[PDB]
Design a protein around this ligand. Structure first.
Ligand SMILES: [Zn+2]
Ligand SMILES: [Zn+2]
Lengths: 275, 117, 150, 151, 101, 67
């Protein structure tokens, strides 16, 4: 339609972790809905079934199962071709809808052993390993760098289990969050008066509020509308930041186009003559 | 264990339609859409695209209850244009802005940034 | 153009009486150029920054389209009829709820005060030759402020 | 466990009938906590709403007429005052002056000083809120609250 | 309070002070100013009001005017005025005897 | 009982930063600087680690890791 504006993007900054950008000339409802997709709708792989062969550790089993689900997983190369479990024709699991992990450790040593993310092995090809320690040459590598201490073991304890990771999205459980956090900010100088400051001098100025550099603090304009939203998406590490954004928009496109097909389905099946 | 299974928050049931349209009994050229298993994320944005249109007299949505996944969208248009076509255009236009946003973001990434992969 | 019930250019005596105030509303105290009328009116100071010392032109009418009823509103953006002065800078819609004047003795009916309510924003007007246009029933009054003169 | 006791309950002990208690002919139940604070804050006549939010509030209301009211401010841009949207909520056309006794003003001698509307005192007429701010004395378990008159 | 004040506010005068010969407020009632019977019956009404006022002073010696009673007659009159669109400045259209009976 | 994978409030993974922290405190008495080097900017992620108590260490010491 003629009244759709071309918004606009600018990437301010990009790292292996963060992606920080500005969206301009668009609606807040768009900005807010797109921020919500970054959390909930972007799909990923995380452990979903844990089968415990032997567990002599001082942590109870369901605790091991909890810590273990929550650990992060690379998915970028494979999260797309993977299908959803319920949709897949197979009974239980298969190579085509899930990937398998195996963990086997025993404390035969006199010193306390730690159980870590590297000790967890993918029966699936090393296309989808755990986040930490693989292709590395990583300056983020410090001391142990176990990514997670699944448990500690004293001389005599042992741990054997199987796990099946599956594709799903954050609306269903928090283990599937593809974000470390999501900053969102709009109209930093409070031109539009969406908040009303009592004694405005008592508030600090963000890094986006530098415009008048002065201390005049918030010049008013009532003819304005919300424009130019600032973002800073931050990667949990399990999916690189730009891929989070591109997959979010596509998923949102997929969800919208589908609602259009059902709305079409109303005009095709049960001919739209009710109203 | 009186808690519902978490998938039910978003998975469609085989005995329910994705969308339903009912006519208003009060005023003409009003319509009521029921969207099942879809929260504020879809609803808030479709409300805004309808408000953006200049021929929409009224547009709004309500999620009747937190515990029940369902939203309703009521729309009222001028005595000339039908509310269904406005809804069709509202998504299609929204599809167009988001596609252009995805295009513009991707090309923006295509800037000589060296950590794109 | 709407049929005119009342029309005059007023000058502002004060913008903050007693001082209790609020914010985003201000209570005007005014005096008419015909000096036979007085006026008190609440206004949205946030979007229409008025100031003391300048004469403002105000008009009040019960209609917009030609010279007939229309209070059925929902206001309808789609109307394109140039019947509206629309050239005015500040417009408010409301009803008149109360009117007052000496009404006891011989003749009585001496001058007149009218009380109006624009959605919670109040107005008080005093007069005499405006008795044909005042009520304590009937909604549909529009308050137009324009030009702010020179 | 039968239609007979279900009939008896529906007619005698059903909650909506239990509003005004025969102990002291007043409301047993009124608008309480946050909503009560939120009503005061909403009815102050410095509160203005733009087309988008008014429609959403209209949307949450049940027995809405279907017609959208004309905003108390036409220009530069349409705005509805808070009193105006509260006034759709009042059923039919009940009436009551006062029924505020809010801290406001100057008890005993302020209303006698010009009736400079002072906005404090609440007046409702023909089912529309004309002026004032709503509080526990208007909305609460009061003898003359809006709620009592509505019943 | 004040017997004189009660008399002033309640009594329907017939001597008609030169303030619009009954043609103020009331309408055609200017035509029933010449009626003897209507004068005696209202004079009878006022006679009951002095006797009621006397009994009511015995019932409530303390002098409180707050009593529990049904209907709330005054709010009803307001509901009545508001709906029929009654303008209190316009002249009346009501016969006093219709009211008393 | 051992530091949780991912901070409650937001999600930033945090168990990985525990072993690193005991090393920094041994090196320096700068809890401010220690938390900073680990990258725990915002304080929700910071309370997580700053307020943890590693009970596991006392718990492991029982011999009978056999029942
Ligand atoms: Zn499968
Ligand atoms: Zn955190």
């Amino acid at each position: 339609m003629p009244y759709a504006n071309q918004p606009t993007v600018r990437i301010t900054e990009l790292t292996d972790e963060n992606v920080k950008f500005i969206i301009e000339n668009t609606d807040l409802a768009v900005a807010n809905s797109i921020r919500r997709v970054f959390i909930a709708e972007v799909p990923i792989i995380a452990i979903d079934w844990v089968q415990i062969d032997a567990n002599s550790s001082v942590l109870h089993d369901e605790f091991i199962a909890h810590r273990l689900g929550l650990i992060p997983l690379i998915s970028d190369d494979i999260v797309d071709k993977l299908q959803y479990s319920r949709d897949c024709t197979c009974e239980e699991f298969c190579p085509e809808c899930s990937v398998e992990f195996t963990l086997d450790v025993r404390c035969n040593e006199d010193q306390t052993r730690h159980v870590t993310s590297r000790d967890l092995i993918s029966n699936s090809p090393r296309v989808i390993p755990v986040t930490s320690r693989n292709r590395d040459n990583d300056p983020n590598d410090y001391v142990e760098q176990d990514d997670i201490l699944i448990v500690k073991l004293r001389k005599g304890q042992e741990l054997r289990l199987r796990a099946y990771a599956k594709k799903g999205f954050g609306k269903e459980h928090a283990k599937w969050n593809p974000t470390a956090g999501v900053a969102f900010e709009y109209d930093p100088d409070n031109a539009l008066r969406h908040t009303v400051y009592p004694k405005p001098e008592e508030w600090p100025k963000s890094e986006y509020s530098e415009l008048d550099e002065d201390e005049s603090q918030a010049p008013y304009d009532p003819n304005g509308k919300p424009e130019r939203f600032y973002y800073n998406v931050e990667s949990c590490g399990s999916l690189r930041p730009e891929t989070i954004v591109l997959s979010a928009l596509s998923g949102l496109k997929k969800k919208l186009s589908d609602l259009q097909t059902q709305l079409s389905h109303e005009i095709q099946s049960d001919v739209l003559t009710i109203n | 264990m009186n808690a519902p299974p978490a998938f039910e928050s978003f998975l469609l049931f085989e005995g329910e339609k994705k969308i339903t349209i009912n006519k208003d009994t009060k005023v003409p050229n009003a319509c009521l859409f029921t969207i099942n298993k879809e929260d504020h994320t879809l609803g808030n944005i479709i409300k805004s695209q309808l408000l953006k249109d200049p021929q929409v007299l009224f547009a709004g949505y309500k999620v009747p209850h937190p515990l029940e996944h369902k939203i309703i969208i009521r729309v009222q248009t001028t005595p000339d244009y039908s509310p269904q076509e406005a809804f069709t255009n509202a998504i299609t236009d929204l599809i167009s802005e988001l596609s252009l946003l995805e295009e513009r973001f991707r090309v923006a990434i295509k800037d000589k940034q060296e950590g794109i992969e | 153009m709407a049929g005119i019930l009342f029309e005059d250019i007023f000058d502002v005596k004060d913008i903050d009486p007693e001082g209790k105030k609020f914010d985003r509303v201000s209570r005007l105290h005014c005096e008419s150029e015909s000096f036979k009328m007085d006026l008190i009116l609440d206004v949205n100071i946030q979007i229409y920054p008025v100031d003391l010392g300048d004469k403002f032109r105000l008009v009040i009418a019960s209609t917009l389209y030609e010279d007939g009823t229309l209070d059925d509103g929902e206001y309808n953006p789609t109307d394109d009829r140039p019947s509206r002065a629309d050239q005015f800078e500040y417009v408010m819609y409301g009803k008149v709820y109360r009117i007052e004047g000496d009404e006891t003795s011989t003749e009585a009916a001496t001058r007149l005060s009218a009380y109006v309510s624009y959605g919670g924003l109040l107005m008080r007007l005093q007069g005499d030759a405006n008795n044909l246009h005042g009520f304590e029933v009937d909604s549909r009054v529009y308050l137009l402020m324009k030009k702010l003169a020179f | 466990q039968s239609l007979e006791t279900r009939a008896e309950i529906q007619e005698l002990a059903m909650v909506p009938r239990m509003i005004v208690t025969p102990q002291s002919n007043r409301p047993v139940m009124g608008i309480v906590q946050d909503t009560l604070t939120a009503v005061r804050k909403f009815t102050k006549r410095d509160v203005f709403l733009e087309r988008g939010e008014v429609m959403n509030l209209l949307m949450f209301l049940s027995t809405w007429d279907g017609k959208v009211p004309q905003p108390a401010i036409l220009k530069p841009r349409p705005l509805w005052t808070g009193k105006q949207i509260f006034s759709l909520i009042i059923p039919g056309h009940i009436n009551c002056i006062r029924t505020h006794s809010t801290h406001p003003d100057d008890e005993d001698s302020g209303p006698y000083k010009h009736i400079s509307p002072g906005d404090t005192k609440v007046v409702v007429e023909n089912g529309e809120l004309i002026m004032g701010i709503l509080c526990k004395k208007s909305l609460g378990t009061s003898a003359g609250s809006l709620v009592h008159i509505s019943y | 309070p004040s017997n004189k004040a009660f008399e002033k506010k309640f009594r329907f005068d017939y001597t008609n002070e030169r303030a619009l010969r009954r043609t103020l407020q009331e309408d055609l009632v200017k035509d029933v100013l010449s009626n003897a019977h209507i004068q005696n019956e209202l004079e009878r009404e006022f006679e009951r009001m002095r006797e009621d006022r006397e009994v009511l002073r015995v019932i409530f010696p303390t002098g409180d005017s707050k009593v529990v009673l049904p209907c709330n007659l005054l709010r009803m009159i307001w509901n009545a005025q508001k709906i029929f669109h009654i303008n209190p400045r316009l002249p009346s259209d009501l016969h006093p005897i219709k009211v008393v009976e | 009982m051992i530091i949780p994978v991912r901070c409650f409030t937001c999600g930033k993974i945090v168990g990985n930063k525990w072993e690193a922290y005991l090393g920094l405190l041994q090196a320096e008495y700068t809890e401010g600087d220690a938390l900073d080097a680990l990258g725990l900017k915002r304080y929700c992620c910071r309370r997580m680690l700053l307020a943890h108590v590693d009970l596991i260490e006392k718990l492991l010491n029982y011999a009978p890791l056999e029942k």
